Design a protein around this ligand. Structure first.
Ligand SMILES: CC(C)(COP(=O)(O)OP(=O)(O)OC[C@H]1O[C@@H](n2cnc3c(N)ncnc32)[C@H](O)[C@@H]1OP(=O)(O)O)[C@@H](O)C(=O)NCCC(=O)NCCSC(=O)/C=C/c1ccc(O)cc1
Ligand SMILES: CC(C)(COP(=O)(O)OP(=O)(O)OC[C@H]1O[C@@H](n2cnc3c(N)ncnc32)[C@H](O)[C@@H]1OP(=O)(O)O)[C@@H](O)C(=O)NCCC(=O)NCCSC(=O)/C=C/c1ccc(O)cc1
Lengths: 138, 135
């Protein structure tokens, strides 16, 4: 299937392929603490925004209800966060906080730094901006 | 949640959010012919590379084998392609592909390009291709 036709001129294709490659690298770099990007993002949102419910987290990360529930089942079964009553709030446990701190360090040092070096600082920044604009306005 | 911490400065996160929004718009625009992005891309590669096999289509698209087998069962069951002793587009496949390509270019990709600069769009395309190729 060597000829790409219009695929190699379509932004969505290139976006998807880049997204896939970055995920695969994330997974390898963060493997010592066994997080997917979404797992990492959730823990990271929980630690930065305590006392939020399961809906605020899922909606902020564009994850659908039954998908979010399944992912909470995994995180909670691993002892990384807890579901706990609202006067359905979510809290990191100590184990959560510890795996998160380690993950942040692997992500920055091992994964993000290499992507920035590949791209260069100006490109990286213009890329991040254009991506943010697609997400926000497209 | 509202504080985004490091998420808002991480490349992969922005990449994923951008990808999601683009896929969602694609689905909306190509909806008269009922194709996901990967379905379109499989039909397109088959059309452009007649006589190549399952495994080469899948590996060029970065699709694993059992996922690929499942997507061919759907495409074959819709009468869009046939497994024959290799993969072949049917006439109905070629007709839906042609229609799709138009909807993609006119309603979807054109709008994306207009949002960004024409120049910013070309540079985005090229940076994404670099990530896919080299990272
Ligand atoms: C490509 C696959 C084989 C099919 O994707 P799809 O055509 O969008 O099909 P679906 O989204 O309907 O279903 C995929 C699976 O996710 C499942 N799924 C559904 N929602 C749920 C749920 N809420 N909970 C859990 N499971 C669920 C779904 O049921 C299904 O599993 P299964 O039913 O067991 O076969 C996909 O599953 C996959 O393996 N992706 C990983 C690799 C990959 O994406 N490679 C790139 C392919 S090429 C490409 O994306 C092109 C993009 C493009 C973009 C823009 C353009 O202009 C041009 C091109
Ligand atoms: C976020 C979910 C809920 C969980 O993803 P995951 O943590 O990677 O976990 P899994 O890969 O183990 O997927 C769990 C289930 O989804 C299935 N799935 C799902 N897409 C498929 C498929 N294309 N084919 C085949 N099976 C599938 C998958 O097989 C499985 O189903 P099941 O076996 O029945 O429990 C995901 O499934 C989902 O619902 N939607 C994708 C929407 C979404 O990505 N929103 C953004 C979340 S935030 C984010 O991604 C951040 C990235 C980031 C990047 C870099 C950074 O530095 C920082 C952050």
């Amino acid at each position: 299937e060597l000829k790409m036709g219009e695929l190699s001129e379509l932004l969505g294709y290139a976006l998807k392929r880049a997204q896939l490659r970055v995920f695969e690298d994330f997974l390898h770099c963060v493997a010592p603490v066994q997080l997917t990007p979404a797992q990492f993002s959730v823990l990271l949102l929980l630690d930065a925004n305590p006392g939020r419910n399961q809906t605020e987290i899922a909606t902020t990360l564009g994850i659908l209800r039954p998908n979010f529930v399944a992912m909470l089942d995994a995180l909670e079964g691993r002892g990384l966060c807890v579901r706990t009553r609202s006067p359905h709030i979510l809290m990191l446990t100590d184990k959560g906080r510890a795996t998160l701190a380690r993950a942040k360090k692997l992500v920055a040092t091992r994964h993000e730094d290499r992507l920035t070096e590949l791209l260069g600082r100006d490109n990286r920044d213009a890329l991040l901006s254009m991506l943010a604009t697609i997400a926000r306005e497209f």
